Amino acid sequence: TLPVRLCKEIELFHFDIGPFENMWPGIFVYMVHRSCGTSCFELEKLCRFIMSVKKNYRRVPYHNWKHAVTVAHCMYAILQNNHTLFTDLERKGLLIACLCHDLDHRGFSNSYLQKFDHPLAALYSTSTMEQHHFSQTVSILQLEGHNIFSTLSSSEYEQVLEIIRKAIIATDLALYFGNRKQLEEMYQTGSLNLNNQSHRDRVIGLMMTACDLCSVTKLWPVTKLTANDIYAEFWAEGDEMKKLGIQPIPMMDRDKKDEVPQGQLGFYNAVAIPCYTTLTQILPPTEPLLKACRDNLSQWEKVIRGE
Amino acid sequence: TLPVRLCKEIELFHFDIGPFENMWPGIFVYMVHRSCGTSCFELEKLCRFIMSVKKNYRRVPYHNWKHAVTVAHCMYAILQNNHTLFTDLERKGLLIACLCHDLDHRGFSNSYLQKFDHPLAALYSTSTMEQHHFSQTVSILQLEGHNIFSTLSSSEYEQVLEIIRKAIIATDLALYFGNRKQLEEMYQTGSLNLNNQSHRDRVIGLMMTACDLCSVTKLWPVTKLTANDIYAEFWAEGDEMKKLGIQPIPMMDRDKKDEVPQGQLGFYNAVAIPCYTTLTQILPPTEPLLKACRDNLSQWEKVIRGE
Amino acid sequence: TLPVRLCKEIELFHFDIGPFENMWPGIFVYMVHRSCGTSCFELEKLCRFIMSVKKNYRRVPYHNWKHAVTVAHCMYAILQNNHTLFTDLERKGLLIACLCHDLDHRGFSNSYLQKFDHPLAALYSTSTMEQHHFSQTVSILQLEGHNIFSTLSSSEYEQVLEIIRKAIIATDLALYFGNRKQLEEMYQTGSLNLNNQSHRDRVIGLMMTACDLCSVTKLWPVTKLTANDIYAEFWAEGDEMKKLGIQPIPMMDRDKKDEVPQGQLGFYNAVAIPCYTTLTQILPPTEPLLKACRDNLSQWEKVIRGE
Numbered sequence: 001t002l003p004v005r006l007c008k009e010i011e012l013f014h015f016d017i018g019p020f021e022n023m024w025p026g027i028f029v030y031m032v033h034r035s036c037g038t039s040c041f042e043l044e045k046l047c048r049f050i051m052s053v054k055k056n057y058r059r060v061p062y063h064n065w066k067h068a069v070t071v072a073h074c075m076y077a078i079l080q081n082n083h084t085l086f087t088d089l090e091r092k093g094l095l096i097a098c099l100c101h102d103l104d105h106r107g108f109s110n111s112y113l114q115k116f117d118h119p120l121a122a123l124y125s126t127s128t129m130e131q132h133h134f135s136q137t138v139s140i141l142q143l144e145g146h147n148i149f150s151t152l153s154s155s156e157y158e159q160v161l162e163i164i165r166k167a168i169i170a171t172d173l174a175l176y177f178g179n180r181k182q183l184e185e186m187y188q189t190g191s192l193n194l195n196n197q198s199h200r201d202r203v204i205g206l207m208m209t210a211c212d213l214c215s216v217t218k219l220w221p222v223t224k225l226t227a228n229d230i231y232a233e234f235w236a237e238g239d240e241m242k243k244l245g246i247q248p249i250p251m252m253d254r255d256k257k258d259e260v261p262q263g264q265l266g267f268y269n270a271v272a273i274p275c276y277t278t279l280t281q282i283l284p285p286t287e288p289l290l291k292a293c294r295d296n297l298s299q300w301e302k303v304i305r306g307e
Numbered sequence: 308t309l310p311v312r313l314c315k316e317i318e319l320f321h322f323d324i325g326p327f328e329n330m331w332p333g334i335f336v337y338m339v340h341r342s343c344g345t346s347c348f349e350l351e352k353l354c355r356f357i358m359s360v361k362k363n364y365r366r367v368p369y370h371n372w373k374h375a376v377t378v379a380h381c382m383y384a385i386l387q388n389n390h391t392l393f394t395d396l397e398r399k400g401l402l403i404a405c406l407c408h409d410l411d412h413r414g415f416s417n418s419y420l421q422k423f424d425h426p427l428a429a430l431y432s433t434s435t436m437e438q439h440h441f442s443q444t445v446s447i448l449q450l451e452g453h454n455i456f457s458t459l460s461s462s463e464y465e466q467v468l469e470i471i472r473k474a475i476i477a478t479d480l481a482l483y484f485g486n487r488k489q490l491e492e493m494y495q496t497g498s499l500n501l502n503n504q505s506h507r508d509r510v511i512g513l514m515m516t517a518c519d520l521c522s523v524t525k526l527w528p529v530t531k532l533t534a535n536d537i538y539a540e541f542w543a544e545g546d547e548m549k550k551l552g553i554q555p556i557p558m559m560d561r562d563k564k565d566e567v568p569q570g571q572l573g574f575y576n577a578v579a580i581p582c583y584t585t586l587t588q589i590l591p592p593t594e595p596l597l598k599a600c601r602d603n604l605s606q607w608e609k610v611i612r613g614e
Numbered sequence: 615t616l617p618v619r620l621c622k623e624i625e626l627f628h629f630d631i632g633p634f635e636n637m638w639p640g641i642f643v644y645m646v647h648r649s650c651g652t653s654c655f656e657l658e659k660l661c662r663f664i665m666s667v668k669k670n671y672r673r674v675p676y677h678n679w680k681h682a683v684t685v686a687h688c689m690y691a692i693l694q695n696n697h698t699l700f701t702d703l704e705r706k707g708l709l710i711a712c713l714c715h716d717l718d719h720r721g722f723s724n725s726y727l728q729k730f731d732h733p734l735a736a737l738y739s740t741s742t743m744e745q746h747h748f749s750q751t752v753s754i755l756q757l758e759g760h761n762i763f764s765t766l767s768s769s770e771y772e773q774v775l776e777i778i779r780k781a782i783i784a785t786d787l788a789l790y791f792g793n794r795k796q797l798e799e800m801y802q803t804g805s806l807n808l809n810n811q812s813h814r815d816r817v818i819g820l821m822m823t824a825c826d827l828c829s830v831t832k833l834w835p836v837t838k839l840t841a842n843d844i845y846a847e848f849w850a851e852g853d854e855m856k857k858l859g860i861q862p863i864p865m866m867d868r869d870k871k872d873e874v875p876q877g878q879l880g881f882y883n884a885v886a887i888p889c890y891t892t893l894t895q896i897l898p899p900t901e902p903l904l905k906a907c908r909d910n911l912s913q914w915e916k917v918i919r920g921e
């Protein structure tokens with residue numbers, strides 16, 4: 001258990017995990033215990049696993065340890081408000097997947113790695129960083145005393161690793177557009193069926209996108225401050241693009257700061273609002289994420305106007 | 308001994324310890340040896356103690372290792388210019404107290420810890436961080452080979468730990484206002500008596516405030532640059548307050564930068580000038596701190612005007 | 615071998631080593647193998663040496679590990695395009711010298727160390743930091759399993775250490791002006807002779823300056839961004855000068871930012887263009903460095919105008 005205020009507010013979708021890093025591991029363990037149960041993991045193994053995962057996130061402005069636990073919390077909130085839908089293994093796997101989904105991130109996009117000709121791009125032609133995140137996850141699990149899935153049968157172990165793999169790959173935003181489009185069609189026609197594994201994998205994929213982007217679903221003061229972190233990374237990549245003799249897209253171009261308000265508008269309209277609209281259609285109890293997304297859209301519109 | 312320039316200028320109240328971190332331990336050892344004597348501490352134990360204290364200060368903009376040694380230097384200057392007043396134990400304890408007085412500081416105020424519902428606030432209802440600083444000090448002393456007070460009698464050990472405890476607690480600025488007010492009254496009436504232990508504890512408390520705030524007693528270029536560090540911390544806390552859904556006070560509000568000159572004025576008038584005025588009354592050789600404080604007040608007045 | 619793009623573009627003088635730190639060691643090993651040969655160093659010893667050198671560079675804005683490898687690359691490009699001129703030992707020694715030439719740099723100039731009265735200034739009256747860089751190099755070589763020159767004869771070992779010493783000392787820009795002037799005279803009169811050791815030492819000295827300053831020979835986007843790093847250091851030193859009660863020169867004065875374009879002009883005209891002009895005269899295949907320097911001069915002239 002946690003302090004009184006945290007216990008209460010952790011159940012809210014728009015919860016912020018706070019600036020005290022050494023409380024984040026305990027926040028995660030709390031979430032796991034309420035989501036899966038106190039006997040889902042051996043506590044000693046789990047804590048060892050969490051600290052090794054922490055050590056393999058880098059000190060970058062956005063794709064860091066705080067992001068990992070923040071993404072995990074959003075998944076916790078989704079799971080707790082749709083608690084009859086998911087199995088034991090899925091709850092286990094998804095929280096872990098979220099915690100590990102950006103492991104060893106450098107603060108650079110897949111396209112930058114390709115243009116730089118980074119060895120990872122030679123190894124992984126598609127979803128380069130995401131395949132690397134999964135590879136890192138697996139490597140940590142293979143460390144002595146780190147296999148938190150020790151007590152599972154081989155059959156169950158293979159299932160949860162596949163849940164984790166698919167989920168981490170789904171955080172490649174390039175795959176989200178096609179996935180969301182398919183889910184929309186299946187929802188409208190009544191074809192969508194959570195008993196169908198391929199349909200289920202898609203819904204989980206959308207859940208992963210929703211959690212990954214959850215910065216846009218916090219209250220305005222948090223959403224606005226987090227934007228500074230995201231652009232710190234993007235502008236750094238844009239600097240590196242210019243060093244390769246390539247003009248970066250405006251989003252990554254430090255010199256085009258004034259276009260931020262309009263750029264944000266475009267993203268909410270093109271990416272965020274559709275993501276949470278579709279997720280809310282499929283899983284109605286995720287409605288608060290959509291409301292908060294809409295509220296942040298209203299705030300960016302006011303910045304553009306000058307209010 | 309130190310380089311020629313340092314030897315000379317370390318005796319000045321407005322000395323700056325410089326940007327070379329690995330010289331700060333030697334600066335402290337120099338001060339201890341001149342203040343208490345070369346046989347006050349076993350050198351090997353003292354160096355081990357200093358390095359563990361350094362390791363338990365965090366990389367924050369202001370409440371860091373540099374602040375700790377800077378505070379210790381101000382106490383050194385007070386002690387050397389009032390050298391007949393204090394006992395062996397008090398000189399020992401006060402330098403150590405100053406070095407440890409912000410141990411494990413996160414860069415957040417007591418009020419923020421309370422509002423966040425941080426576990427330390429549940430443990431320590433009053434002077435939350437200061438009670439924690441003392442707890443940290445004690446923990447370091449209990450480490451193998453770290454008890455720098457090994458050679459003291461039990462009686463003396465208990466006295467110096469109490470000197471340290473009271474001194475560290477006195478750095479809670481919330482307790483300064485009441486303390487200064489009492490000292491003022493006792494000074495005016497002739498009641499004040501350094502042979503009275505409770506009166507003595509108050510004077511030491513004021514000395515601790517004076518050392519803690521000594522940023523405002525450096526020369527203008529140092530005082531102005533240090534302000535950047537202090538606001539880096541304050542504005543970060545104000546950001547966190549906004550993330551809890553609480554509007555921070557203007558001092559901690561990044562958006563109210565233009566109010567800095569006037570805010571500083573208010574602090575010098577309400578806090579700093581009274582502190583050093585009262586200290587100078589009680590201990591006349593601390594006069595240079597008051598003069599330099601007044602000079603910085605004049606500089607902030609010129610910023611407001613535009614000069 | 616390296617990724618395809620790196621293999622190709624590493625041969626260009628204006629190559630940028632990129633933002634992936636863990637590739638820099640492999641970039642260096644690649645350069646050594648192509649420059650000297652695959653049997654010049656025992657690979658295990660070399661990698662151990664490289665990692666210890668990395669550990670002894672500090673996290674400062676400019677005089678860091680990236681600068682060290684960048685300087686080494688420029689020397690690689692000079693060596694590969696003048697491949698018949700230099701001996702086995704010289705190629706070995708110069709790459710190593712470049713990698714170690716700023717070892718343990720604090721981000722402060724020799725003059726600041728003198729004014730602060732830093733112990734290094736008492737030890738080394740001339741070329742203070744450069745003598746320290748060499749001392750650090752030697753200390754690393756003396757570590758167990760770190761003597762990468764193990765297989766050399768004593769005679770050869772002494773020669774390469776002297777090559778390294780002279781080369782590192784030559785990176786003291788204060789010595790460059792006199793050296794360049796002498797080389798100019800010897801070139802014009804036909805006196806200059808690479809078979810004369812003292813003349814040869816001078817030419818190597820100029821090569822070291824050219825590599826050290828090679829920031830001004832990159833493409834404009836790299837050159838412009840690197841300027842931010844250099845001023846971060848300079849302005850920090852200027853801050854420290856003000857803390858000693860000394861007005862810093864405008865270059866190190868944060869308050870005189872607007873003078874950057876004109877200040878840069880002056881440096882290109884007074885230092886950079888003459889350096890690469892003289893180097894190109896002596897070693898014609900280094901011409902691309904001069905062209906790129908001239909192009910950056912044109913860019914700074916356009917900043918001044920407003921284009």
Ligand SMILES: COc1nc2cccnc2n1[C@H]1C[C@H](Nc2nc3ccccc3s2)C1
Nearest residue numbers: 213215216230250251256259260263264267
């Ligand atoms: C893919 O872009 C983003 N991913 C995000 C994840 C969390 C929060 N925001 C995210 N964003 C973008 C950043 C903004 N989009 C743009 N900003 C600019 C700025 C300047 C010029 C063009 C653009 S597009 C939303």
Ligand SMILES: COc1nc2cccnc2n1[C@H]1C[C@H](Nc2nc3ccccc3s2)C1
Nearest residue numbers: 520522523537557558563566567570571574
């Ligand atoms: C408690 O405030 C401070 N503690 C200090 C310790 C050392 C040096 N300065 C200290 N200060 C304050 C910072 C300033 N006071 C204020 N600044 C502002 C800025 C904006 C709006 C209101 C205020 S009050 C003196």
Ligand SMILES: COc1nc2cccnc2n1[C@H]1C[C@H](Nc2nc3ccccc3s2)C1
Nearest residue numbers: 827829830844864865870873874877878881
């Ligand atoms: C010695 O100065 C420099 N060393 C450099 C090495 C690499 C790249 N640039 C270097 N520079 C200087 C920085 C600039 N010179 C000046 N800048 C200013 C700025 C303000 C006022 C005076 C000056 S001189 C070239």
Ligand SMILES: [Zn+2]
Nearest residue numbers: 101102171172
């Ligand atoms: Zn990702």
Ligand SMILES: [Zn+2]
Nearest residue numbers: 101102171212
């Ligand atoms: Zn992510």
Ligand SMILES: [Zn+2]
Nearest residue numbers: 408409478479
């Ligand atoms: Zn404090």
Ligand SMILES: [Zn+2]
Nearest residue numbers: 408409478519
């Ligand atoms: Zn303090």
Ligand SMILES: [Zn+2]
Nearest residue numbers: 715716785786
């Ligand atoms: Zn140097």
Ligand SMILES: [Zn+2]
Nearest residue numbers: 715716785826
């Ligand atoms: Zn250098």
